[PDB]
Design an enzyme around this catalytic site. Structure first.
Site, PDB file in Angstrom:
ATOM      1  CG  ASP A  43      -1.893   1.193   1.211  1.00  0.00           C
ATOM      2  OD1 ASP A  43      -1.753   2.047   0.369  1.00  0.00           O
ATOM      3  OD2 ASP A  43      -2.760   1.229   2.053  1.00  0.00           O
ATOM      4  CB  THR A  76      -1.993   6.556  -3.912  1.00  0.00           C
ATOM      5  OG1 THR A  76      -3.262   6.598  -3.245  1.00  0.00           O
ATOM      6  CG2 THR A  76      -0.884   6.782  -2.897  1.00  0.00           C
ATOM      7  CB  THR A  77       1.716   4.894  -6.599  1.00  0.00           C
ATOM      8  OG1 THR A  77       0.906   4.097  -7.473  1.00  0.00           O
ATOM      9  CG2 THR A  77       1.621   4.342  -5.183  1.00  0.00           C
ATOM     10  CG  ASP A 345     -11.789   0.732  -1.577  1.00  0.00           C
ATOM     11  OD1 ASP A 345     -11.826   1.774  -0.966  1.00  0.00           O
ATOM     12  OD2 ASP A 345     -10.966  -0.127  -1.369  1.00  0.00           O
TER      13      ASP A 345
END
Lengths: 477, 506, 527
Positions: A43, A76-77, A345
């Site tokens: 994560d 996020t990434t 989600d």
């Protein structure tokens, strides 16, 4: 310039940590605590959670990830990797070419506008009113969750959730809000202990876990008159034509029998805050003492009243005809919490498609397509901005690069094959994760909500300006 | 990474040349280990004095020796092209492109570059050997050495060149112009306007005889002797002096040169009767006298065989800048094969450095000989910027990872138009993007008109963008460019191929 | 404030750590195994071959080893054994991988083959298992199972001692009519002052506090047991004034007479239930105390009297005989008493212990760990706690697996020959097919190494017999003979293994190795 260089070196390290955290085959990162703890999580939020950083520029990379996660549940990434290389590819342009930061910042703004043009061009339309396709879309889009075997309702639960919250307005008078959704607040999900995941259902209104005082009671009233009271008195209640008596505190036998004699149900242990939620979906007046009950105690807007027990607890249904309550069922509160970890989600997945009814070519085809389209624009752009404009193109190639690297293929040759496939071929050519082969997204779907790519690029260029605009790091208290 | 360490080494000499090349270039102070201050823009003089440390530098330095010996120009073009060709390779290395793949790319570009250089030809020197055709080339060669002094040096060289290029016609197989055809001397004092050119040999040593001049006849005959002059010694041992000139003059000799020492009476009598006496410490200069005065040295003593006498028009002693010199020259006849550049200048560094520049201008004329040397290229990076655009086109035409190498290959040719800017003081953030647009146009035609002539402005004429090379007649030698590309391409290939440096058994 | 390896040498760090856990936790494998010494610094030595003890109670210096150990700790909490095989499988999976890593195979490609092999390993496990019937005449097979688990953890001379003890223990707890077994109903006791070979099986329950009075009967042939919660010691009603020695006890005995009336009522039970009748007896076990004179009267009626009982054992004692806890002697009835056989209190000079055996219907048993030293009692305690769970795995799961590594040996052959001919993976992923099969040899290899027999030659002799089965068209279970040096047949010799243990061993080993092989950077947090 030395201070600006130190800002660049900060983000390069942040990216080198997150660089290989992208992909279904992502390599694991080892988090060493000073107490001897070791966590191998994939994560990237958890990675960013523990990364102890020095340069405040890295702290802005953390605030960047907070911004992305709070708005778009994913990205996020993608943002950390994208934003970092956007800064990194500009490094020789700052140091060697002696380009003033203002020139570089202005160039990134123009690349942002042009990039949004390409993102629109590569989009694929999807009909949000085709619920059957939205189920196939969201169910595939939530791919790799714990509820794959329960994904039928774990998907449909979220589809029926967003079905109603849609902030629906469209006209040339005020504008189209575009179905703005607030999953945090507007949606109030009531997780019901007991049942199974597939037994979960969706309601309309507010649902309370406050139980009933007497087993014999008026079970259903289509048009009730609800009295919200906290505390002769039992007779005073009936003066205002009530059908339901709700008490904040505990309730004795006298309130059970006296009100039942007149055809009124008895509900206990309902706080004034739940009495306010009753007012939100029905409209009864909150009163403390029974001697203070007045004719304003009304049960309007009450579509269904239900008293059924689930999970050693009787529930009070406040059903009415930007708000909804889901009757989620789970064998335990941890199963109910596992539903949230997978269901909400999916709510974000649906929020993204409901935000814009458009899909993005996955497998990294979006990014390589941008890297080609920007190149054609660059040679046609005059000015010093010919140099920094090319930086975004080189930065957009990192995301497809990490998809190759974590796939174990040749990181150099496979990228050059992708370049030719997007150059002369279709914009839909991406990277397969399992085979490691260059595949068209027509065959291997992986179609991603476009707004994820739109907000990812917007927040990346935005943060790039925040990192470049800093000229020195000064101490002060 | 040996290739990474090599990149670090070349960054040192890259910094040396990056600020050197160009008429606006910066000088370097070079301190000789024997106690000489050398201030010059010549990077060949620099590398001759620079001690070499990292073996990868030995590749680049020996490369410049190939350029300088075989071609009288291209010194910085090798160092400048080589520096950047290896700098841009750092990106290819870091992108993961292997050494052999980078090598393969530069070799593929070697073919692309040479073919395009043949198409970049603008004009051609038709080999008229005319002062005007010489100036078209001599001026840009003198440029980059002394900025604004081309007027003094161009009149010096182009006139001196006409002395060593004799009237030649229908001559493409007869070679002319040896490098030693032009001599340059240093006289401390005066300034640029005090320099001149003598149509023949000038001895830096002061007049050794007491005679100033010969007769007034044309083609004064002259003798050179090899054996020491003294009373006739027999063929063996012996354990007349002036009679030599009684023999020499029989054919018409007014000037008597002795390649050896002088006997007692002749030292007085050779000069007493009005004959110039000479003894030369430089024996190659005696071979020069064979070429200037036409004199055939007599291998024997006191026996000037008629075939051992030459014909020289005029030999006088002359005063240059107040320091006396002796002149053995020709005059409108028996035309001298050597002409002398008289440099009067007060600063011994500028005086010597001016010679260093003129030495290179002499060398350029050696490349203005017939070996396909008339081809002109557009100067001021018009060759370089146009190569950039044509190289990137070959990238679009080339599939494979070679496309990545070709792209970085074009970037390397930006170092030359960049260097022209950084030394000239115009903003590289403005000049370079204006160069791109000036040469990158959509021509209504296959022949770019006025767009292959776009240049780089090194002058103080303030203008946004760049100028036209035809304004000053700035053309580059094709052979200098073509040979330089071959040297730098192979030299960089060499450095890119060094995987490990191993010390030999000791 | 950051430290990491941009070079992949982080794999060299992780592999180095695994090689350590190998060299430490490998030498304990097999009845030819060696024993590790844990020294706690307080002067206590724990002499153990058990992996869980060596995993949970070792000082781990390597930060990577922390994961392998804590992950392996999950093996015992699922199956109850197999912790050593996890450690060995992980190390060899990482060591064989290092070979392929240096060849340029991306950790993904190696990891995917580890997962592909897991899918294939489940096929073999189900095909290789031997379905066991539920016949209680399985004593031969159950005895053989005990030897498999005991011969590992004890010295082979305590195996003949512990084999009938554990076997008969689990035969008692295992319910008929296909009802389950409850290992919490099997008691394990610690007793000193005897030798390790004196460990004994008790049909019932043994109590700590014995009789402390010279007239306490030694034993009762047919005993009726009372659980009494009434305070029989000095109590008083919820003025005492004496002027001489004569008047002191008259007052206190009168206040204790409230007890003595119950002491009368207790012997009224004794007279109600076989006061003088032969072949019948009366055992009292009191939660509260018994007055010294109340013991004298209990001797008067030949009553075996116990006092000051521990609550939890007293709750068991109701289950032991099936009687009821008596809160008042005035409620004392003749049918409350529970019946048992030989009840005797064995005298240990430290403390006499009460043996309550041949009980009504307890379905519960006690294993008394005998041994003088602390290191011996601990080793035996592990052997019992382990073996009871080993025999439980067999009675719970009717499937037994031929042991002596036949699973790890034959799985090698099937994964080597078939997988590429199956086309079940890919051409490049074949490095994982080979890596896994080569690592499956770490178990049969280590078994041989610890015996001193030739590692290569013994593996060769195994393969020779396995080849005979191919032409013989018969099932030949071939295993490693750790005694003679050659091959053997686990089904003839009696070496057995667990279906569930091997299922979770391969599953877990794949997970641990996959997590470590995919490691990229080691990051520092909070610094």
């Amino acid at each position: 310039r030395q201070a600006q260089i130190s800002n660049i070196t900060a983000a390069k390290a942040v990216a080198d940590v997150i660089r290989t955290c992208l992909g279904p085959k992502a390599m694991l990162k080892m988090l060493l605590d000073p107490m001897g703890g070791l966590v191998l999580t994939n994560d990237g939020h958890a990675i960013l959670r523990e990364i102890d950083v020095a340069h405040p520029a890295a702290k802005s990379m953390l605030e960047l990830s907070r911004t992305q996660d709070e708005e778009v549940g994913d990205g996020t990434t993608t943002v950390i990797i994208l934003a970092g290389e956007i800064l990194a590819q500009c490094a020789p342009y700052l140091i060697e070419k002696n380009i003033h930061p203002v020139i570089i910042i202005q160039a990134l703004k123009k690349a942002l506008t042009d990039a949004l043009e390409v993102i629109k061009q590569v989009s694929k339309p999807v009909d949000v009113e085709n619920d059957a396709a939205m189920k196939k879309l969201i169910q595939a889009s939530i791919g790799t969750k714990y509820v794959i075997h329960w994904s039928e309702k774990m998907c449909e639960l979220a589809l029926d959730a967003v079905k109603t919250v849609r902030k629906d307005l469209g006209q040339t008078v005020e504008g189209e809000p575009n179905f703005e959704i607030d999953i945090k607040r507007y949606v109030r999900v009531e997780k019901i202990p007991g049942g199974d995941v597939l037994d979960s259902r969706v309601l309309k209104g507010v649902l309370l876990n406050k139980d009933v005082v007497h087993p014999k009671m008026s079970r259903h009233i289509e048009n009730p008159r609800v009295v919200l009271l906290d505390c002769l008195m039992c007779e005073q209640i009936l003066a205002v034509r009530p059908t339901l008596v709700i008490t904040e505190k505990g309730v004795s036998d006298l309130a059970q029998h006296y009100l039942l004699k007149g055809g009124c149900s008895v509900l206990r242990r309902v706080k004034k805050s739940d009495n306010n939620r009753i007012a939100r979906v029905t409209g009864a007046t909150i009163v403390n003492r029974v001697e203070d009950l007045k004719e304003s105690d009304v049960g309007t807007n009450c579509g269904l009243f239900k008293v059924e027990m689930i999970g050693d607890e009787y529930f009070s249904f406040l059903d009415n005809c930007k708000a909804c309550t889901i009757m989620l069922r789970g064998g335990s509160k941890d199963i109910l919490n596992e539903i949230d970890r997978n269901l909400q989600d999916a709510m974000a997945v649906a929020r993204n498609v409901m935000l814009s009814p458009s899909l993005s070519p996955g497998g990294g085809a979006t990014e390589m397509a941008v890297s080609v389209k920007l190149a054609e624009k660059a040679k046609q752009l005059e000015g010093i901005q010919q140099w920094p404009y090319q930086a975004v193109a080189d930065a957009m190639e990192c995301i497809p690069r990490t998809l190759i690297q974590n796939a174990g293929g040749d990181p150099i040759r496979l990228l050059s094959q992708l370049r030719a496939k997007h150059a002369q071929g279709n914009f839909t050519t991406g990277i397969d994760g399992d085979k490691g082969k260059i595949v068209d997204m027509v065959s291997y779907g992986i179609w991603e909500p476009e707004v994820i790519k739109q907000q990812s690029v917007k927040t990346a260029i935005e943060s790039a300006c925040l990192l470049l605009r800093v000229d020195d790091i000064v101490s002060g208290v | 990474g040996q290739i990474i360490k090599s990149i670090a080494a070349i960054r040192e000499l890259h910094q040396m040349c990056l600020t050197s090349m160009g008429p606006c270039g910066r000088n370097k102070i070079i301190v000789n280990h024997l106690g000489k201050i050398i201030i010059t823009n010549d990077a060949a003089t620099m590398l001759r004095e620079l001690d070499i440390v990292h073996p990868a530098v030995k590749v680049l330095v020996m490369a410049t020796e190939q350029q300088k010996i075989d071609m009288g120009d291209g010194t910085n073009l090798v160092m400048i092209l080589a520096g950047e060709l290896l700098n841009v390779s750092e990106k290819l290395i870091s992108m993961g492109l292997s050494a052999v793949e980078i090598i393969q790319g530069y070799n593929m570009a070697r073919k692309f570059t040479l073919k395009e250089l043949d198409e970049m030809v603008v004009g051609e020197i038709t080999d008229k050997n005319d002062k005007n055709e010489l100036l078209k080339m001599i001026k840009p060669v003198i440029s980059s050495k002394k900025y604004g002094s081309e007027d003094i040096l161009s009149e010096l060289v182009s006139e001196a060149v006409s002395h060593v290029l004799p009237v030649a016609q229908q001559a493409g197989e007869i070679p002319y112009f040896n490098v030693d055809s032009i001599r340059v001397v240093k006289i401390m004092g005066g300034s640029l306007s005090n320099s001149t050119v003598i149509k023949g040999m000038v001895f830096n040593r002061e007049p050794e005889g007491h005679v100033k001049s010969l007769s007034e006849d044309k083609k004064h005959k002259v003798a050179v002797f090899t054996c020491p002059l003294d009373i006739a010694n027999t063929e063996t041992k012996g354990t007349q002096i002036d009679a030599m000139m009684k023999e020499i003059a029989d054919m018409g000799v007014e000037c008597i040169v002795a390649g050896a020492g002088v006997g007692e009476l002749a030292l007085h009598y050779l000069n007493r009767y009005g004959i110039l006496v000479l003894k030369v410490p430089s024996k190659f200069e005696l071979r020069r006298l064979c070429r200037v005065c036409g004199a055939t040295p007599l291998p024997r003593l006191g026996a000037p065989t008629p075939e051992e006498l030459g014909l020289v028009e005029t030999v006088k002693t002359m005063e240059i800048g107040g320091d006396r010199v002796t002149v053995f020259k020709q005059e409108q006849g028996e035309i001298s094969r050597t002409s002398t550049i008289i440099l009067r200048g007060a600063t011994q560094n500028n005086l010597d450095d001016i010679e260093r520049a003129i030495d290179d201008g002499v060398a350029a004329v050696k490349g203005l000989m017939k070996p396909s040397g008339g081809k002109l290229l557009p100067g001021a990076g018009a060759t370089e910027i146009e190569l950039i655009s044509r190289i990137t086109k070959y990238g679009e035409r080339t599939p494979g990872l070679l496309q990545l190498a070709i792209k970085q290959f074009a970037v390397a040719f930006e170092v030359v138009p960049r260097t022209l800017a950084e030394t000239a003081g115009l903003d590289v953030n403005e000049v370079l993007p204006n160069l791109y647009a000036a040469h990158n146009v959509t021509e209504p035609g296959a022949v770019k008109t006025d767009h292959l002539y776009k240049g780089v402005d090194i002058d103080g004429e303030s203008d946004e963008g760049v100028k036209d090379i035809r304004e000053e007649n700035i053309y580059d030698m094709l052979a200098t460019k073509k040979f330089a590309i071959n040297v730098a391409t192979e030299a960089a290939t060499t450095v890119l191929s060094i995987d490990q440096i191993i010390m030999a058994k000791k | 404030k950051a430290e990491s390896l941009r070079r992949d040498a982080a794999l060299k760090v992780n592999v180095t750590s695994a090689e350590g856990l190998q060299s430490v936790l490998e030498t304990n494998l097999g009845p030819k195994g060696t024993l590790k010494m844990l020294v706690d610094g307080a002067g206590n030595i724990k002499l153990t071959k058990d992996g869980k003890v060596l995993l949970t109670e070792m000082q781990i210096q390597s930060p990577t080893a922390v994961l392998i150990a804590r992950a392996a700790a999950a093996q015992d909490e699922i199956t109850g054994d197999g912790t050593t095989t996890v450690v060995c499988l992980v190390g060899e999976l990482l060591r064989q991988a290092h070979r392929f890593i240096q060849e340029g195979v991306h950790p993904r490609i190696i990891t995917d083959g580890f997962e592909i092999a897991r899918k294939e390993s489940m096929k073999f496990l189900d095909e290789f298992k031997i379905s066991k019937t539920n016949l209680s005449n399985d004593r031969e097979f159950l005895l053989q199972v005990a030897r498999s688990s005991l011969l590992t953890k004890v010295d082979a001379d305590l195996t003949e001692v512990l084999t009938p003890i554990v076997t008969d223990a689990v035969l008692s707890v295992y319910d008929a009519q296909a009802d389950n077994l409850d290992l919490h109903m099997v008691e394990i006791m610690q007793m000193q002052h005897l030798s390790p070979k004196d460990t004994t099986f008790i049909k019932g329950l043994v109590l700590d506090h014995g009789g402390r009075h010279p007239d306490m009967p030694t034993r009762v042939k047919n005993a009726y047991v009372l659980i009494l919660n009434v305070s029989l010691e000095y109590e008083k009603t919820e003025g005492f004034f004496y002027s001489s020695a004569d008047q002191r006890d008259k007052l206190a005995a009168s206040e204790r007479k409230f007890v003595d009336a119950k002491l009368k009522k207790i012997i009224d039970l004794k007279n109600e239930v076989c006061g003088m009748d032969p072949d019948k007896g009366f055992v009292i076990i009191n939660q509260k105390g018994i007055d010294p004179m109340s013991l004298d009267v209990f001797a008067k009626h030949n009553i075996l009297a116990l006092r000051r009982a521990k609550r939890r054992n007293m709750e068991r004692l109701q289950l032991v005989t099936g009687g009821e806890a008596q809160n008042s002697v005035e409620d004392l009835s003749p049918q409350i008493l529970g019946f048992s056989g030989l009840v005797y209190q064995e005298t240990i000079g430290e403390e006499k212990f009460t043996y309550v055996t041949e009980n009504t219907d307890p379905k519960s048993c006690t294993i008394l760990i005998k041994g003088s030293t602390h290191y011996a009692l601990a080793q035996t305690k592990d052997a019992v706690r382990d073996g009871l769970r080993a025999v439980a795995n067999v009675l719970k799961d009717k499937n037994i697996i031929p042991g002596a590594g036949a699973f790890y040996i034959a799985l090698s052959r099937y994964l080597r020959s078939a997988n590429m001919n199956k086309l079940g993976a890919k051409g490049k992923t074949k490095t994982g097919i080979e890596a896994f099969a080569e690592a499956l040899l770490v178990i049969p290899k280590t078994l041989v190494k610890n015996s001193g027999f030739d590692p290569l030659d013994v593996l060769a002799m195994v393969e020779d017999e396995l080849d005979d089965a191919q032409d013989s068209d018969e099932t030949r279970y071939v295993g490693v003979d750790l005694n003679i040096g050659d091959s053997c047949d686990p089904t003839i010799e009696g070496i057995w293994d667990s279906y569930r243990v091997l299922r979770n061993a391969i599953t877990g080993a794949t997970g641990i190795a996959s997590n470590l092989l995919l490691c990229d950077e080691l990051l520092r947090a909070g610094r």
